[PDB]
Amino acid sequence: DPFTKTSLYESTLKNQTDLLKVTQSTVEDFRSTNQSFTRALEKDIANLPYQSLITEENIINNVGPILKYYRHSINALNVYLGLNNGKVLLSQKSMPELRDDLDIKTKDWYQEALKTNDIFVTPAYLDTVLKQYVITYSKAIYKDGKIIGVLGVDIPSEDLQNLVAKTPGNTFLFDQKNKIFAATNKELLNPSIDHSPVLNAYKLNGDNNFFSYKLNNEERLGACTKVFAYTACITESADIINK
Ligand SMILES: CCC[C@@H](C)[C@H](N)C(=O)O
Ligand SMILES: [Cl-]
Ligand SMILES: [Cl-]
Ligand code: NA
Ligand code: NA
């Protein structure tokens, strides 16, 4: 009876929408926690007197400890300050030392921090030295208008993937390239799975707009929404409305 099917459809829409929100929140809160951390670090570095910031030895001795304590406080992989001479002061998981081999002026985290007055957030990428996938938060630090260097903080992208996977619902994230990035059902991360149906249904319907689509000639229901450069989706079987 249409009345019954409408009731089930309105219920499941609300539910699935709510769960999609949870996944959206997860991504937002991950980012903002890392941003706040980075901002606080910026502030403590810029607070130092110039004298502590204007020689490399002073950077080592005065900024290094700050990098280290901050790194430990959140269990970041790397926390670092890149200088215009190409050297980096690096605090890494497993005192901080100056490194001259990290080709920083070719790195987006460095370049892009100098082109915005905000924190820059990279797509996930393979960390040069630790060979883990990371998301980097970078920020050009200025003390009274004078550039000191570019701060970077590397957080394992697995941390976000794990958070998303724990969420209720069959929710998942695509990265900026529409490749699968995280999922509650680990099987979805098969790079051979085609997601065209879901992605085409999202493109037709827009953010947070519930839709029908087919899998193996069965009916499924879902929704997606943009969250920063990610696309977050939920889908379920339409058996809840049909049977
Ligand atoms: C070993 C620190 C690497 C940092 C500077 C950064 N993750 C990069 O790959 O450029
Ligand atoms: Cl993020
Ligand atoms: Cl952002
Ligand atoms: Na958080
Ligand atoms: Na991305």
Distance CA 190, CA 179 (A): 10
What is the residue with the minimal CA distance to atom 3 of ligand 1? Answer: 128
Distance CA 23, CA 93 (A): 29
Sign (positive or negative) of CA dihedral 233, 170, 189, 22:
positive
Measured from the CB, is residue 231 less than 6 Å from ligand 1? Answer: no
b or e along 220-229 (b: 16 or more beta carbons within 10 Å of the residue's beta carbon)?
bbbbbbebee
Ligand 1 mutation target, pool 94, 128, 135, most atoms within 8 A of CB: 128
How many angstroms is it from 178 CA to the middle of ligand 1? 25
Ligand 1 atom closest to the CA of 103, numbered from 1: 10
How many angstroms is it from 134 CA to the middle of ligand 1? 9
Ligand 1 atom closest to the CA of 104, numbered from 1: 10
The secondary structure of the chain as a DSSP string is -HHHHHHHHHHHHHHHHHHHHHHHHHHHHHHHHHHHHHHHHHHHHHHS-GGGTSSHHHIIIIIHHHHHHHHHHHT-SEEEEE-TTS-EEEEE----EEES-S-GGGSHHHHHHTT-SS-EEPPPEE-TTT-SEEEEEEEEEEETTEEEEEEEEEEEHHHHHHHHHHSSSSEEEE-TTS-EEEESSGGGG-TT---HHHHHHHHHH-TT--EEEEETTEEEEEEEEEETTEEEEEEEETHHHH-
How many angstroms is it from 33 CA to the middle of ligand 4? 5
Measured from the CB, is residue 129 less than 6 Å from ligand 1? Answer: yes
Ligand with smallest separation from the Cα of 173: 5
How many angstroms is it from 124 CA to the middle of ligand 2? 9
Ligand 1 mutation target, pool 38, 92, 105, 127, most atoms within 8 A of CB: 127
- Technique behind the model: X-ray
